[PDB]
């Protein structure tokens, strides 16, 4: 399928144990997609002081359209030293590995896979 319904656990930035997916734009997009498939991907909502507490390159989910069955359609954009790889709508959050942190909420998304 081109799209897959996911419910992403929303984590508080200070709980996050693994603060990014890797060391290149290509690796973080790769790892993010693998974790999203495996159900091991969390979401941190971007506010003041969040991103400096996470590791670059960043992987964002961005709104790709205006929401089947409550799932906002999203796609991945990476960022490294202020350059983004991909073009999409508004950021819903930054993706991180999920390794058992307790979420505060779930974000239903339809991921362009």
Swiss-Prot record:
Which purpose does this protein serve, as stated in its record? Inhibits host translation by associating with the open head conformation of the 40S subunit. The C-terminus binds to and obstructs ribosomal mRNA entry tunnel. Thereby inhibits antiviral response triggered by innate immunity or interferons. The nsp1-40S ribosome complex further induces an endonucleolytic cleavage near the 5'UTR of host mRNAs, targeting them for degradation. This inhibits the integrated stress response (ISR) in the infected cell by preventing EIF2S1/eIF2-alpha phosphorylation upstream of stress granule formation and depletes host G3BP1.
Where is this chain's protein located in or outside the cell? Host cytoplasm
Q: Which domain of life is it from?
A: Viruses
Question: According to the UniProt record, where is the region Disordered?
Answer: 1-113
Domain annotation CoV Nsp1 globular: ranges: 2-113
Q: Which residues form the signal peptide?
A: none
Whichever gene encodes this chain, its name is rep
Q: What is this protein called?
A: Host translation inhibitor nsp1
